[PDB]
A paper describes a structure:
As a substrate receptor of the CULLIN3-RING E3 ubiquitin ligase complex, KBTBD4 is recurrently mutated in medulloblastoma, the most common embryonal brain tumour in children. Here we establish that KBTBD4 mutations promote CoREST degradation through engaging HDAC1/2 as the direct target of the mutant substrate receptor. Cryo-electron microscopy analysis of two distinct KBTBD4 cancer mutants bound to LSD1–HDAC1–CoREST reveals that a KBTBD4 homodimer asymmetrically engages HDAC1 with two KELCH-repeat β-propeller domains. The interface between HDAC1 and one of the KBTBD4 β-propellers is stabilized by the medulloblastoma mutations, which insert a bulky side chain into the HDAC1 active site pocket.
Importantly, HDAC1 is a paralogue of HDAC2 that can interchangeably associate as a member of the LHC complex. Co-immunoprecipitation experiments with HA–KBTBD4-PR efficiently retrieved LSD1, CoREST, HDAC1 and HDAC2, showing that either paralogue, HDAC1 or HDAC2, can associate with mutant KBTBD4. Altogether, our results demonstrate that HDAC1 and HDAC2 are critical for CoREST degradation by KBTBD4-PR and are functionally redundant in this mechanism. Indeed, we were able to assemble a complex formed among KBTBD4-PR, HDAC2 and CoREST, and determined its cryo-EM structure at 2.87 Å resolution. Superposition analysis indicates that CoREST-bound HDAC2 is docked to the KBTBD4-PR mutant in a manner nearly identical to HDAC1, confirming the functional redundancy of HDAC1 and HDAC2 in the mutant KBTBD4 mechanism.
Numbering used by the authors:
A (entry chain A): 9 to 375
B (entry chain D): 1 to 128, 134 to 135
C (entry chain B): 26 to 536
D (entry chain E): 23 to 536
Amino acid sequence: KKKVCYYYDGDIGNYYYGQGHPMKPHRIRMTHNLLLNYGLYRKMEIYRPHKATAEEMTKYHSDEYIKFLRSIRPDNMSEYSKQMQRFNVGEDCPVFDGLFEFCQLSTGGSVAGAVKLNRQQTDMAVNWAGGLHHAKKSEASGFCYVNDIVLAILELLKYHQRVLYIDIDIHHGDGVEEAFYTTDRVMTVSFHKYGEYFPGTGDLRDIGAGKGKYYAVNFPMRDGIDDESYGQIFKPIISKVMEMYQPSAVVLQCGADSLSGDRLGCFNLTVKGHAKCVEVVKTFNLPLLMLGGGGYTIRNVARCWTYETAVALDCEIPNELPYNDYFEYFGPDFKLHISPSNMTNQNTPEYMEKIKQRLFENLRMLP
Amino acid sequence: MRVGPQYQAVVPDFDPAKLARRSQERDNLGMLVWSPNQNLSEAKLDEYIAIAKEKHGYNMEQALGMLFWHKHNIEKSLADLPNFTPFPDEWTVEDKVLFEQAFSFHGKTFHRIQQMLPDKSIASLVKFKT
Amino acid sequence: SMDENYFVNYTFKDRSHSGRVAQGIMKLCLEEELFADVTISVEGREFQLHRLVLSAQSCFFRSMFTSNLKEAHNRVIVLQDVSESVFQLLVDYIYHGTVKLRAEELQEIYEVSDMYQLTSLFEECSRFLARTVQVGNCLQVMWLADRHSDPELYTAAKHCAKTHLAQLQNTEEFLHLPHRLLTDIISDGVPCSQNPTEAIEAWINFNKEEREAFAESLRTSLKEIGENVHIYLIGKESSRTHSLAVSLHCAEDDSISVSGQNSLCHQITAACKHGGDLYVVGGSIPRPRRMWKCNNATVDWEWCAPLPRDRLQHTLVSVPGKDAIYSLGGKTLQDTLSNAVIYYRVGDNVWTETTQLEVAVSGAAGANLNGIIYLLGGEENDLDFFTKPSRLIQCFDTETDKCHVKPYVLPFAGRMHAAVHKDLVFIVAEGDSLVCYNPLLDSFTRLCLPEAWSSAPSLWKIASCNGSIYVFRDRYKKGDANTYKLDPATSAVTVTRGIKVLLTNLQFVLA
Amino acid sequence: PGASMDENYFVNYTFKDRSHSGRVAQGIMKLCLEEELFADVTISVEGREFQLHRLVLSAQSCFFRSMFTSNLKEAHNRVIVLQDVSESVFQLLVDYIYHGTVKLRAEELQEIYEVSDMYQLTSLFEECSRFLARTVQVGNCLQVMWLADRHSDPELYTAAKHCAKTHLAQLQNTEEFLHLPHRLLTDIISDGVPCSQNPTEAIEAWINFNKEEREAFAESLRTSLKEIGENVHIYLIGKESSRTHSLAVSLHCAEDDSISVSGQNSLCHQITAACKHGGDLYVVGGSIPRPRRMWKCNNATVDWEWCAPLPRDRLQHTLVSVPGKDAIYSLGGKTLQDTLSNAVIYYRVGDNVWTETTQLEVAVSGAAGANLNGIIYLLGGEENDLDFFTKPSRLIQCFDTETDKCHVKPYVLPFAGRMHAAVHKDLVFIVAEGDSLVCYNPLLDSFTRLCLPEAWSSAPSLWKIASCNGSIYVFRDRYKKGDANTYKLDPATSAVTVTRGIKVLLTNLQFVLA
Ligand SMILES: O=P(O)(O)O[C@H]1[C@H](OP(=O)(O)O)[C@@H](OP(=O)(O)O)[C@@H](OP(=O)(O)O)[C@H](OP(=O)(O)O)[C@H]1OP(=O)(O)O
């Protein structure tokens, strides 16, 4: 019977990255509608996030980068060409109308959730508009401009000695691992696909630098991992991290591109196998901040995030989707749960056991 | 992996005494829109939602926000909806026809669609199956 | 091998025994010609031969010599079904192992090799005949393959006969062929442009006394198919700045025409033409893993499963034998050459991983020959952390999932375009050179391209269709559809017309 | 192999059958032996009649070709008898001529050698000469040397000459050496004999055998008598149980089948690799994380002139000495980033400069190295799999130091993991865990396997191998209390004995170098 808080801004779904861009901010509007029509909206506290000021963003990002983000518009792209080249903005991180407002809303939801958890006013905080884990300190990467996870953790670090960050996106959380690479107050755990893949980092040999050595766990994967293998490897590693690190707050990034049938991912998970991670994390009774992430098949993202929000509330919802404004998006089955494909799992038990044993050896060296 | 002062974040300094000190003040961020009430009955909430829907075209979110406004009391909420009915975006059939023609000419470039539809913002064009 | 030790006793096997024996036989029986024990008289010319070599090379002569008869045991053997020249050719092949094959005496060598049971020469002559089959000799070659029980030559001749059926009707050789050969011709599926029905009526009306009873069976087995010939011309137009995929249809007289177009709204890093469909791989530069599929009928783009890895300048090869599309090699976004091999199952919509290449290359050209992928040229990994042009050939055997590197090298190095014509690969690179590669004989052949276009060092693209090779220019000058038609038999090029789509840039030419 | 212009596959071209020679050979074997057809000559050896074919005999040898052509009476003769060859030897030669494979034995080796020389059977003659040089010893060194003199064989002559020079003391008083020709004795002495043989006494005895005619030759022998130092050495280093300093022990083993300590040296540096080049020791060491300190200073060299450190920081790399180029090659290894390396570098002793070379086909570490006439063999080790970890390897790689090319052999070793290799008489002897010893013949691409004494196999002890003068010594890594467990193996009869008398105090054996 914990308390769950929900952050949502009604205008987040009206921002368009561009034509043919895989990133659709509309996957949060359909998630919100599914939550409303499933009855889970009435079960939590609903907040309208504040717009994070530029001064809050510069707690991590540089002042020049935030100033460029505030100044650039599609109308005046001619005068900033050198600035766009320097800050990695324009090719894959396009300049679109209302970019800074989108960043402000995404950052404000996460920071408000972290503040709410700091004051012991809630046990869980949800923000599906956040979770942009690729943005760097002074440049944009991977559809992300402002790293709100880093700012949320920096808010949490004001009150908690140790914070644990878990990332179940199919991509490496390079923006968050880089920021907290040389500190032991944050341990960054990442499960990701490795080998000629974006972003190119996340090696098993990357364990931390300087004062924060052994405080960066990486679990490289192969193609086609399913629910059974993911469940077999997730619970032991997380239990060992809990035993060794002993954190006081958790930030969980629930990226939905590790589902089956994604437009950009190559895993074979389902909605239940995705939410098993949320179920496992929830058993440790620590403050939790549940953030969004990837996910490029929009209906699957909506289903996964709705089921994970139901899991957080400890509420059961029927497999038959209710009537919502986007009922035509979920046809023709009109079911909440998806079925896996027939791809082969390249993660053989020997490889998985070797990686797990190496990670266990690395975790036992924690001071 | 790049290690440097311009790559990493400046974490605070741990202050054990200052942890459980300031968690009552400063700034609470976000605006409360809805909060559960245990004394409220499920049947009463469902009936209020149904009447708000088939009385003035109030969706679930708007009716829930109105109920939170009147201190979770249904009686003062059933007699306050007609005072200010929330007229939605007024998309006339003419404007829809212009949107369809602009989409046919240009496509999903809302920047160009706004050129011949200047009375609508881009956020209104993105929000606006067949 | 357990009691064998190199200090007391062991078995010594000479690996140079066979070559030494063969060379000694050639040197003894060619230059000096001693120890001749048999005499073969062909058209009045006596050949002093050795029955040991003859019996070791063919079962016909072995049974002639061992199981002796009146003619084969008195003093001499006289052969009457073979002329002097072809018999001298066969003697040269038997004794030396090397023979010069000409198309002017191909059928006679084929028949005599079948008679004397020289199986390797028979297979080579059959491959030559299937290469050079055309309209005028189609039914004659069909007769030859049927009489000599040659399946592959039969299918080659029958495929050539079905696609030119309209021209065959006015010929007596088509009116005189029997019922069964016509069932094999019809059943495979005749294109509608050849008017199979008119051919059937003409054949059945040639002699209506004892042929009308076959009408029902002939009409029931008739098969009509769509447009099986296709070339795709992904490129950029002057007006539309995104892209354009243009379809090309080639008629029976070897003329290309535009049969459709479909603008591409994304940026493309690789393309392929599995079957009659077009597959493109692209998206963005950081993540070039998204895949789409197009059909000329649908005029749309259906998204497929994403690539398991994102690479640049990888090779897309279509293997219709296993119904899959292969992605070999490439260059990662960290400027590192890749040697991974992954294939895509069209029926399942699933990507899978296979064995890796021996050498990691990028920018190579891909060609499929009966289920074997050849990786030609590209970019190799230079020692000093750089990359250099590649001139080696890699052989990925699809059936057994194995990779090999050919000991020989291509005549040229770098980037090139390949096309499979008949059982051969045509390769074109920068420098006005056209190379025909025969992977079964491990040999190359250069066709000289006129130096009229040597001033501009532009890329060249080649595509093949029903008996000719079309060569395309990457850098099209304004208002000039410069496409040339190559005839491999005579190596004569000819400027072609009929293309009226102003493609300023030619990015991909698919089959 | 250029692209032809006068040939096109649609008009006319040249077809060459690559299966012609094999088919011809197989047909010849079948017809001639399984069915015995078309025989045109008869050869009689010791009353045994052979029905052979003149074509097959003339295609293999020039002796038989000139014998058969001979266009006179002696060519067209019914039966030709041969008198210098036994029936069994002729049967073996016929089998070799017709099949291409023969079974060589040491009891008939000299007869086959002579007959193959007489009949111009070049490849059989070369293989017989290699076999004869492999198994030369005291009892036949002079006889083999005189045998190779009549047949003009340089390699066998040098092998027998080295065998006779190394054991001159035993041959000094023998009867055969007394009637040695002057040129043969000059060839023996001028090569350079060890000081333990006492060549002066031998030449004095030879002169005293016939003082009348050999007196004039006395001065030439004294002038041409050159002596050399001791280079037959085994350098084994190790760590004592109670001492943390590695001690390098040098051994000299004479022809009397006895091995003894020649000296000891103490080194206080942890050692990751070592090699024996010439007569002096080369050691690669260093402290973490800079393990590239090549050793130039000790009490035996009394110098400190900074022997060129390795330009790469690697572990478990292979140090192989190539005396032909006076170079030491450092192949493979594992870098500090836990990734296997395929870097090959060499070190010229006179130049004192490390130079990079072409990489290996695969990256390995811990592989055994062996030099066979300028070709380096990397055997075993560990290779990467499940691509963050390593897996034991059973691969063979060759590195030709002349053409600077690397190849991977199609076959694999019978065992995998960590091995120790020793080159003994143009053969590589490889040992590993499991008490199995493997002899490798790279020329024939074949293995033979002896089973070492498995009386003590439960102990997880490593085995080291070092060849010495026709005998192989096997060293036990885990020595017992008071037991210097060393075994001497004679590869001819596969008899393993015990060599008590060598007083090694090293509890743990790190490197055994030869
Ligand atoms: O080509 P993209 O930019 O990646 O986007 C298109 C399309 O957008 P456009 O109409 O601007 O081309 C999407 O529709 P909207 O988001 O604009 O409504 C739609 O994707 P969703 O269904 O996720 O919205 C579609 O994908 P689908 O084939 O699933 O309809 C997707 O991709 P295509 O390139 O395949 O059309």
